[PDB]
């Protein structure tokens, strides 16, 4: 289960430079250690700050404001694969940011074969109104009075032998 963390670093302030830029970003990780490692990697890559002169001011966990509210999430993702790195944008209809990022990671590992090692979450934002969604598969669930069945349900059997010839009707 993923979790959202906030990490800030200001590169061990020295003489003549008190309170540096104080780089701030949000990191999604399953634990504090992984969040700190990802923050260090992002600082090394995007910025010129390394752990040699770095410092973790504070790490905090951010909880989604409305864990029971359905939202459409627009995520900008930059990931690396066998080919060169390129930007990517996707839209996810989920309830919480953590679930949306988890689904994005699962899709990337499934379709693009990209795993957590080479995936960067640039930004996660909520789409407020309809007709701003640019993906058809997300617009699919926005239709008014959406009703559909669940044909051919895969019923589970607790016994090897069943004297019923079960039907998959729903």
């Amino acid at each position: 289960h993923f979790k959202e963390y906030q990490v800030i670093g200001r590169r061990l302030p020295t003489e003549s430079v008190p309170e540096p830029k104080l780089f701030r970003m949000r990191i999604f990780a399953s634990n504090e250690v992984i969040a700190k490692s990802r923050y260090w990697y992002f600082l090394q890559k995007l910025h010129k700050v390394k752990k040699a002169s770095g410092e973790i001011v504070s790490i905090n966990q951010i909880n989604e404001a409305h864990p029971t509210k359905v939202k459409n999430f627009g995520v900008w993702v930059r990931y690396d694969s066998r080919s060169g790195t390129h930007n990517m944008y996707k839209e996810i209809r989920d309830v919480s940011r953590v679930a949306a990022v988890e689904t994005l990671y699962q899709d990337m590992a499934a379709r693009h074969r990209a795993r957590f090692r080479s995936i960067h979450i640039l930004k996660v934002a909520e789409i407020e109104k309809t007709a701003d969604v640019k993906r058809q598969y997300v617009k699919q669930f926005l239709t008014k009075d959406l009703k559909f069945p669940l044909p051919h349900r895969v019923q589970k059997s607790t016994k090897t032998f069943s004297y019923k010839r079960p039907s998959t009707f729903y």
Partner: protein
């Protein structure tokens, strides 16, 4: 749970059914398989037909008879599929195979006894909808089986008079339900209902 289990092989996967039957056999359970010709295998017919040829093409040069044996009956094919899943060439494996019987259709006295199915081996429960599948009977007929006509002819007779037996059972259950209904609302019936019966 049952001294002998009769499994209806119609609309079942050869692989899963054979695996479960072998596993039950290794546990000391007697199982009888019926309607082997109706067994189904995933994939289009040509793929299954091509697969059969490449296993019989390996006929030994010096001694073909003592070498691979190619059986066309669907029951023989099912037994071969299940045979490989059991540790044959050993006393434990040989004893287990003695508990399994495979027949085409439902020969008596099994025709007059209850039969069961394996939910995890049903073709209509595992295969994705709309996907191609192969029938064991048609494959056997293509590869040399010559008893499909008689099998179907005497299986149709099996449904004949068994529909009549079911009709008689339904008529009897009509009177049984009427007797239960007229016996309802009584003190004993009310007590049974309160006690979950």
């Amino acid at each position: 749970v049952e001294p002998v289990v009769v499994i209806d092989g119609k609309g079942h996967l050869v692989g899963r059914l054979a695996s479960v039957v072998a596993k039950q056999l290794l546990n000391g359970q007697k199982i009888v398989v019926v309607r082997a010709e109706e067994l189904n295998i995933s994939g289009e017919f040509f793929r299954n037909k091509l697969k059969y040829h490449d296993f019989l093409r390996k006929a030994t040069a010096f001694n073909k008879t003592r070498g691979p044996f190619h059986f066309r009956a669907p029951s023989r094919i099912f037994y071969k599929a299940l045979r490989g899943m059991v540790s044959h060439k050993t006393a434990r494996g040989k004893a287990a195979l003695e508990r399994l019987k495979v027949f085409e259709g439902i020969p008596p006295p099994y025709d007059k006894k209850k039969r069961v199915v394996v939910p995890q081996a049903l073709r209509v429960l595992r295969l994705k909808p709309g996907r191609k599948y192969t029938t064991l009977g048609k494959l056997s007929t293509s590869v040399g089986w010559k008893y499909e006509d008689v099998v179907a002819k005497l299986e149709a007779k099996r449904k004949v008079s068994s529909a009549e037996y079911y009709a008689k059972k339904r008529a009897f259950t009509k009177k049984v339900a009427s007797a239960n209904a007229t016996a309802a609302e009584s003190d004993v019936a009310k007590q049974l209902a309160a006690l979950g019966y």
